[PDB]
């Protein structure tokens, strides 16, 4: 999470940063 999710983050535009996330 956070890392690999990064690829997804670029899309989320929050992932990694938030850290906590949720939805």
Swiss-Prot record:
<comment type="subunit">
    <text>Monomer and homodimer. Has a tendency to aggregate into amyloid fibrils containing a cross-beta spine, formed by a steric zipper of superposed beta-strands. Soluble oligomers may represent an intermediate stage on the path to fibril formation. Copper binding may promote oligomerization. Interacts with GRB2, APP, ERI3/PRNPIP and SYN1. Mislocalized cytosolically exposed PrP interacts with MGRN1; this interaction alters MGRN1 subcellular location and causes lysosomal enlargement. Interacts with KIAA1191. Interacts with ADGRG6.</text>
</comment>
<comment type="function">
    <text>Its primary physiological function is unclear. May play a role in neuronal development and synaptic plasticity. May be required for neuronal myelin sheath maintenance. May promote myelin homeostasis through acting as an agonist for ADGRG6 receptor. May play a role in iron uptake and iron homeostasis. Soluble oligomers are toxic to cultured neuroblastoma cells and induce apoptosis (in vitro). Association with GPC1 (via its heparan sulfate chains) targets PRNP to lipid rafts. Also provides Cu(2+) or Zn(2+) for the ascorbate-mediated GPC1 deaminase degradation of its heparan sulfate side chains.</text>
</comment>
<comment type="similarity">
    <text>Belongs to the prion family.</text>
</comment>
<feature type="glycosylation site" description="N-linked (GlcNAc...) asparagine">
    <location>
        <position position="9"/>
    </location>
</feature>
<protein>
    <recommendedName>
        <fullName>Major prion protein</fullName>
    </recommendedName>
</protein>
């Amino acid at each position: 999470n956070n890392f690999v999710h990064n690829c997804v983050n670029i899309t989320i535009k929050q992932h990694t940063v938030t850290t906590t996330t949720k939805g």
